[PDB]
A paper describes a structure:
The collectin family of mammalian innate immune system proteins recognizes pathogens by the repeating pattern of carbohydrates on their surfaces and organizes their disposal through neutralization, agglutination, and opsonization while recruiting immune system cells for their destruction. Bovine serum conglutinin has been shown to bind, through the globular carbohydrate recognition domain (CRD), to specific carbohydrate structures on complement effector protein iC3b, which arises following activation and cleavage of complement component C3 (12). We present here high-resolution crystal structures with and without bound ligand of a recombinant fragment of the C-terminal carbohydrate recognition domain of conglutinin, the first crystal structures of a bovine collectin. The conglutinin CRD monomer has an overall topology similar to that of the known collectin structures.
A further structure was therefore determined, to a higher resolution of 0.97 Å, utilizing 2,4 methanepentanediol (MPD) as an alternative cryoprotectant. This structure did not show any extra electron density in the ligand-binding site, except for water molecules, and is therefore designated as the native structure. In the unliganded structure, the lack of electron density for the calcium ion at the Ca2 site is accompanied by a lack of electron density, or movement away from the site, for some of the side chains of the Ca2 coordinators. The second calcium ion Ca2 is not as tightly bound as Ca1 (as evidenced by higher B-factor compared with Ca1) and is not observed in the structure without bound ligand. This may be because of a number of interdependent factors including the loss of order of 318–323 in the calcium binding loop, loss of Ca2 coordination by Asn-318, the lack of an interaction between Asp-320 and ligand, and low calcium concentration in the crystallization buffer. In the unliganded and αGlcNAc-1-P–bound structures this Asn-318–Pro-324 loop is disordered. Within the structure without bound ligand there is some ill-defined electron density for the loop that could correspond to the ligand-bound loop, suggesting a small degree of order. However, it would not have been possible to discern the location of the loop without the prior knowledge of the position of the loop in the ligand-bound structures, supporting that the loop is mobile in the absence of ligand.
Numbering used by the authors: 230 to 317, 324 to 351
The structure:
């Protein structure tokens, strides 16, 4: 089970992993890391973070061009929800239980939320 918005479904098993391990878990499940593209999608992911009491990874990263955060397609963000002062190396993105985002080191261990 999980939270859905439109045709997108977000799911978690409560796993806590580094970015690379998180990406592999979602891909092996035939999904990808949570990639909220709208307010409504962001709120669905946020509800799951609040339930699990653990910040989660989003998919987006700036490893290709610093400051330019992209999806696994390589396309630029169509939506963002950065915390005050963010983005403030921190190439990956976490989402807080208040729904705001913070760039983080990709070695950080965070909740794994996948989208389908
Ligand atoms: Ca940061």
């Amino acid at each position: 089970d999980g939270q859905a918005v439109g045709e997108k479904i977000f799911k978690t098993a409560g796993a806590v992993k580094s970015y690379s391990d998180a990406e592999q878990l979602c891909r092996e499940a035939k999904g990808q890391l949570a990639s909220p593209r709208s307010s409504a999608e962001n709120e669905a992911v946020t509800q799951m973070v609040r339930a699990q009491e653990k910040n989660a990874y989003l998919s987006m990263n700036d490893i290709s061009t610093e400051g330019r955060f992209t999806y696994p397609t390589g396309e630029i963000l169509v939506y963002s929800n950065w915390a005050d002062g963010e983005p403030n190396p921190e190439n990956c993105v976490e989402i807080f239980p208040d729904g705001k985002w913070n760039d983080v080191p990709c070695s950080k261990q965070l909740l794994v939320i996948c989208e389908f």
